[PDB]
Design a protein around this ligand. Structure first.
Ligand SMILES: NC(=O)c1ccc[n+]([C@@H]2O[C@H](COP(=O)([O-])OP(=O)(O)OC[C@H]3O[C@@H](n4cnc5c(N)ncnc54)[C@H](OP(=O)(O)O)[C@@H]3O)[C@@H](O)[C@H]2O)c1
Lengths: 676, 188, 94
C-alpha cells in the first residue's frame, strides 16, 4: 500500500493494526484537498483504506463508515495514522476505528479518533459485471457547465489543488446526475492505489454538481457511508451515476469506461462542515494567512431619511435631558423607578414598551470597588429581566451608558467603569441573542435626541456623537493617506519635509546619520519628545526638494557616549538642542545638554531649550540688560515672548509688551499691568 | 532578571515590589499579562466568581496606574482578550474585566500617557482554558503561532491606536455557515 | 531487548505492543527449563519483560502479576509472543 505498512498483530482486542506515516513531502497531494482554509484528508481517503484492508481480512464490504472530525494536514512532517481491524464475530463482521496523533508526539498526549465503522463479508458473484453497451450518457440528460468549475468551487470554499481537479464532463437528469472523472496526473510508481482517493473524491465532487443539497450555500463533506462494495481493481478513469437513495441520502454507482462496476455506494449522507472543525493549513489564504492586526472602527451612519420611533420605558435614574430626547419623537411611554414597578404598571394596563432603557450613571471612581458594584448590579438586573414573564419580556433591554467607548481616533476620554458593564452585556448578548442592546452617549444633550434613531438600527452595539449614530466594525489595519503617519521599517527615522510644498507631504523617513558611529564630543539619544517652532511649519511647506532638517530641541535618554565625553553616561535623562530630533533616535553635541530636573515630564523638558535660550542669550548676552532698565517685548504671549517675560521679571526689568487683545489675559498673568 | 511572588491586586504587595527596584535602574515600562478565568453563564455566575476574574485584570491594572504616577513609562502594555470584543458566551466576568482593560488604555491615552490594550486572539500553546479554546473556535478564531503572535506585539508598537486586536480569523468559514457576527460584516 | 522488538503503538486500547519471536535456534536456553516432560517458559521470564517495558513507560513496579497457563516451547520455530501495555489511568497505573 502506498501509505500503509504491514499489518501489526493484536491478541488483546483480537485482530490487526495497519500503521501509516503521513507527510506532504512523501505525498504532495495529501494537502491538495482543502476546505475553507484547512488542508485536510478527504473522506474518500478513509474509504480506500477500508476496502483494501477489508478485502484482505475477509470483510470486503463496508456496512457503515462514520467520520467524527476531520484530520488536518499541516506542513511537512504530517501526523501518523493507525487503522485497527477487529476480530471476526459470530457472523464474520469486524469493527473499525481510525486514529491520528501529531508526528513525534509524546506517549502522554492522546490520539484523536477520526473514523469508526463496521465491515462485513460480501460476495462479488452476485452482479459481477455490467454490459458494455448501454447508451451512456442517458438520453435527455442536460449538459453541465464544466468550464471554469475549479474557480467556482474555490469561491464557495472547495479549495482543490491540481491533484483532485478531474471532473471533465457531467449531466443532470432529474433526480439523478451522470459524470465522468479522471485523475489529472496518472501515478507512475508501482506502489499504487486501486482507485486514487483523489479520483473517488472527484466522484464525490459530482454531488454538488446537482441539486441534491439544500440551497443554503454552505459547504458539505462526507459524514457517513453505508453499504459500500468494491469489486474491480485498477481504475484511473470512471463513469459515475448518482441517484437519490432516500430523502436525505444518495446512492453512488461508478463504472469504468467499459461498464465494469468498480465501486458502488448504497448510501452516502453529507453534513455541513462545523467551522469548529478546522485548524490552519494555510494553502491559499481565504482569510488571515498568519494572522493580522485589526482595530475596531466606529463609522457614522447616514442621517436617517425619516423620523424613527419606538415605544420607550425609562427605568431608573433619569439623567436630566434624556427623557426629553425620547419624548420628542413621541416614543416615551413611561418613567419608572425600577423594574419591579414597570412589571406591575403593565400588568395593571400600562403600555407594553418596545424598549426598556436602563440609564447607567457616569462619575463612578475608576477603582476596583465600583467595578464590582457596576457588574454585580447589571448581573442582578439581567437575571431579573429574563425571569420577567409575559409580553414585557419580548422588549429590548437597552443599556444606555455615557462615554463608555472611544468613538474617534483621538484623545477621546472614556469611563472604564461603564465599559466593564459594556463587556458583561457583550457576553450576555451572545448567550441570549436579541435580548439586550448597548448604546453609548457623549455629554451632548443633542445625542439623547438621536437615541430613537439609534434604535432604528438593528445593530446590537451603538454609539451616538453629536446626534450622529456610529456603528462599530472590526477592520484590518492598513496605511491610509488622510491619516496618521507610519514609521519606516528602520529603528531610526525622523520627521522630514516632503518637498511637494504641502503638509500632506510630511513623512517619517529613515535617518541613518543618527545610527552612524559617533565622532568626538557627541552622544546618541533615545529621544522621547521634541519641540516645534513656527519655523518648522514653514520648512514643511515650500516646494524646493532640498529642505532644512526639521526639529531644534528635545529631551530623552542617552545610549552611547564618545570616549572623550565626561559628565554624561548611558542611562542619563537629558534635555538640550539638536537638529533632526523629530524621531526616536538623534545624535547631539554634549556641550548643549543639561540634566532633566527631577519631576519633569519629557514633554516639559523638551519644550524649554529653544524659547529660554533665545530669551536668555538676548536679554543677558546681547543686550546686557541691567536691573531697572525698561524692556519692550512684541508678541509677549508667544513662545519666546513668554520666556522673555519670565527672565525679565527675575532681572529687575520693567516690562512693556504687546499681544492680541484676547491674549492680554496671558500677559496680565505673567505679571503685567494694563498700563504695561 | 528577578522573579517575585506578588498578587498585582494586593496594593501593598505591589508597592512593596516597586519600592524594592534598584534606584540606578528605575522602572520605565510595564507589560501586564496577569489573568484568571472562571467561566459561568449569566444566570449562574456568582459574586466571588466575578471578584476572582476582575482581580488580576481590573484591580491590578488600576494599582499599576496609581502606584507609578511618579514614573513616566515609555511603554505600558495591557493584554486583553478578543472575547471582550466579540462576547464569548459563558464568560461574562472575563469580558467585563478585559473590557475594562481596553477602556483603561483609552483612559490613559486621553491623559497623555503611554498605553495600549491588546485584545489577543488565540495562542498555539489548562482545563479552564480548554473550555475557552472550544468557544473561541466555535466563533471562527484560529490559533496564532508563537512567533507570529510576538511579531504583532512588535508591529503594534508602531501604531497609535489605544486598542488593537492581534488575531487570525477564518472569515470564510463563517460566511459559508452563515454565522457572521455584525462586527465582522465588512471582512467578507 | 534480546527477545522483544520495538514498541508498536496502539490508539484504540491506548498504549503499546511489544512483539517478540521465540525460537530455540535463536535462544537455545528457551527449552532448558522444563517440568514433567514439557519444555516451557519460566514465570521468571514474564517478570523480566514486565520490569523492562514497565520502567520505560513509567510503571516500573509490578503491583500484581498473574500466570494463567504455561507456554510450552516445542522444537525449532517456536511461537511468537506479544506484550500489551495499557494507557495511564487516573493514578498512573497501566
Ligand atoms: N530654531 C529657530 O529657528 C527658532 C528659534 C527660536 C524662535 N523661533 C521662532 O519663535 C517662534 C516659536 O514658535 P511658537 O510655537 O512658539 O509660536 P508663537 O511665536 O508662540 O506664536 C506666534 C506669535 O507671533 C505673533 N505674530 C507674528 N506675526 C503675526 C501676524 N501677521 N498676525 C498675528 N500674529 C502675529 C503673534 O501675535 P499675537 O500675540 O497677537 O497672537 C503670536 O504671538 C517661531 O516664530 C520661530 O520662528 C525660531
Amino acid at each position: 500500500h502506498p501509505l500503509l505498512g504491514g499489518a501489526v498483530e493484536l491478541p488483546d482486542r483480537g485482530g490487526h493494526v495497519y500503521p501509516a506515516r503521513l507527510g506532504v513531502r512523501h505525498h504532495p497531494w495529501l494537502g491538495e484537498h482543502a476546505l475553507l482554509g484547512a488542508a485536510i484528508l478527504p473522506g474518500a481517503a478513509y474509504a480506500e483504506l477500508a476496502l483494501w484492508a477489508g478485502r484482505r481480512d475477509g470483510a470486503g464490504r463496508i456496512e457503515e463508515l462514520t467520520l467524527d472530525a476531520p484530520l488536518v494536514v499541516a506542513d511537512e512532517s504530517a501526523a501518523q495514522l493507525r487503522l485497527v481491524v477487529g476480530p471476526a464475530d459470530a457472523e464474520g463482521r469486524r469493527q473499525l476505528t481510525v486514529h491520528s496523533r501529531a508526528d513525534g508526539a509524546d506517549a502522554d498526549t492522546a490520539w484523536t479518533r477520526h473514523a469508526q465503522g463496521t465491515l462485513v463479508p460480501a460476495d462479488a458473484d452476485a452482479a459481477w459485471s455490467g454490459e458494455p453497451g448501454a447508451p451512456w450518457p442517458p438520453a435527455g440528460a442536460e449538459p453541465v457547465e464544466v468550464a471554469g468549475l475549479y474557480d467556482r468551487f474555490a469561491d464557495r470554499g472547495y479549495q482543490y489543488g491540481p491533484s483532485f481537479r478531474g471532473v471533465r464532463a457531467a449531466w443532470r437528469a432529474g433526480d439523478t446526475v451522470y459524470a465522468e472523472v479522471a485523475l489529472p496526473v496518472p501515478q507512475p510508481g508501482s506502489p499504487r492505489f486501486g482507485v486514487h482517493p483523489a479520483l473517488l473524491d472527484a466522484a464525490f465532487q459530482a454531488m454538488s454538481l446537482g441539486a441534491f443539497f439544500p440551497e443554503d450555500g454552505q459547504v458539505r463533506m462526507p459524514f457517513a457511508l453505508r453499504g459500500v462494495s468494491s469489486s474491480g481493481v485498477g481504475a484511473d478513469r470512471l463513469r459515475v451515476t448518482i441517484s437519490p437513495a432516500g430523502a436525505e441520502a444518495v446512492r453512488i454507482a461508478c463504472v469504468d469506461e467499459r461498464g465494469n462496476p468498480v465501486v458502488v455506494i448504497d448510501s452516502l449522507v453529507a453534513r455541513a462542515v462545523p467551522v469548529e472543525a478546522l485548524t490552519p493549513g494555510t494553502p491559499g489564504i481565504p482569510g488571515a494567512g498568519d494572522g493580522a492586526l485589526h482595530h475596531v472602527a466606529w463609522t457614522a451612519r447616514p442621517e436617517p431619511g425619516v423620523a424613527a420611533v419606538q415605544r420607550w420605558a425609562v427605568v431608573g435614574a433619569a439623567d436630566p435631558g434624556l427623557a426629553g430626547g425620547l419624548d420628542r419623537a413621541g416614543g416615551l411611554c413611561g418613567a419608572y423607578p425600577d423594574l419591579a414597578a414597570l412589571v406591575a404598571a403593565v400588568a395593571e394596563g400600562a403600555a407594553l414598551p418596545d424598549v426598556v432603557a436602563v440609564p447607567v450613571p457616569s462619575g463612578a471612581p475608576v477603582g476596583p470597588d465600583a467595578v464590582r458594584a457596576t457588574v454585580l448590579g447589571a448581573l442582578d438586573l439581567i437575571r431579573a429581566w429574563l425571569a420577567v414573564e409575559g409580553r414585557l419580556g419580548l422588549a429590548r433591554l437597552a443599556f444606555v451608558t455615557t462615554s463608555a467607548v472611544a468613538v474617534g481616533d483621538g484623545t477621546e476620554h472614556v469611563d472604564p467603569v461603564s465599559a466593564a458593564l459594556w463587556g458583561l452585556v457583550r457576553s450576555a448578548q451572545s448567550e441570549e441573542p436579541g435580548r439586550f442592546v448597548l448604546v453609548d452617549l457623549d455629554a451632548d444633550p443633542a445625542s439623547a435626541s438621536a437615541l430613537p434613531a439609534a434604535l432604528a438600527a438593528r445593530e446590537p452595539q451603538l454609539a451616538v456623537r453629536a446626534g450622529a449614530v456610529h456603528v462599530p466594525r472590526l477592520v484590518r489595519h492598513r496605511p491610509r493617506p488622510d491619516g496618521p503617519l507610519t514609521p519606516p521599517a528602520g529603528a531610526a527615522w525622523r520627521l522630514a519635509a516632503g518637498g511637494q510644498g504641502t503638509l500632506e507631504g510630511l513623512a517619517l523617513v529613515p535617518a541613518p546619520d543618527a545610527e552612524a558611529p559617533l565622532t568626538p564630543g557627541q552622544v546618541r539619544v533615545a529621544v522621547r519628545a521634541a519641540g516645534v517652532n513656527f519655523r518648522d511649519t514653514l520648512i514643511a511647506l515650500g516646494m524646493y526638494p532640498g529642505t532644512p532638517v526639521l526639529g531644534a530641541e528635545g529631551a530623552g535618554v542617552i545610549t552611547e557616549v564618545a570616549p572623550d565625553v565626561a559628565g554624561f553616561a548611558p542611562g542619563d535623562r537629558v534635555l538640550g538642542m539638536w537638529t533632526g530630533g523629530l524621531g526616536p533616535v538623534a545624535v547631539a553635541d554634549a556641550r548643549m545638554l543639561a540634566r532633566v530636573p527631577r519631576g519633569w515630564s519629557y514633554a516639559e523638558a523638551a519644550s524649554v531649550p529653544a524659547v529660554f535660550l533665545t530669551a536668555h542669550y538676548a536679554l543677558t548676552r546681547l543686550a546686557g540688560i541691567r536691573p531697572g532698565q525698561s524692556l519692550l517685548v512684541h508678541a509677549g504671549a508667544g513662545g519666546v515672548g513668554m520666556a522673555t517675560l519670565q527672565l525679565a521679571r527675575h532681572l529687575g526689568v520693567e516690562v512693556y509688551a504687546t499681544a492680541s487683545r484676547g491674549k492680554w489675559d496671558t500677559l496680565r498673568g505673567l505679571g503685567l499691568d494694563d498700563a504695561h | 532578571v528577578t522573579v517575585v511572588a506578588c498578587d498585582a491586586a494586593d496594593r501593598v504587595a505591589l508597592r512593596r515590589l516597586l519600592d524594592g527596584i534598584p534606584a540606578a535602574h528605575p522602572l520605565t515600562a510595564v507589560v501586564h499579562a496577569a489573568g484568571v478565568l472562571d467561566d459561568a453563564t449569566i444566570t449562574a455566575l456568582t459574586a466571588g466568581q466575578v471578584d476572582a476574574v476582575l482581580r488580576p485584570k481590573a484591580d491590578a491594572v488600576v494599582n499599576l496606574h496609581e502606584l507609578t504616577r511618579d514614573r513616566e513609562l515609555s511603554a505600558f502594555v495591557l493584554f486583553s482578550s478578543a472575547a471582550a470584543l466579540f462576547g464569548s458566551p459563558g464568560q461574562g466576568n472575563y469580558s467585563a474585566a478585559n473590557g475594562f482593560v481596553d477602556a483603561f488604555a483609552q483612559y490613559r491615552r486621553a491623559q497623555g500617557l503611554h498605553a495600549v490594550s491588546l485584545a489577543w486572539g488565540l495562542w498555539a500553546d489548562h482545563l479552564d482554558q480548554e473550555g475557552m479554546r472550544r468557544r473561541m473556535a466555535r466563533g471562527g478564531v484560529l490559533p496564532l503561532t508563537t512567533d507570529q503572535g510576538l511579531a504583532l506585539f512588535d508591529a503594534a508598537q508602531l501604531v497609535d491606536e489605544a486598542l488593537q486586536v492581534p488575531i487570525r480569523l477564518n472569515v470564510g468559514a463563517l460566511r459559508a455557515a452563515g454565522k457572521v457576527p455584525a462586527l465582522l460584516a465588512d471582512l467578507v
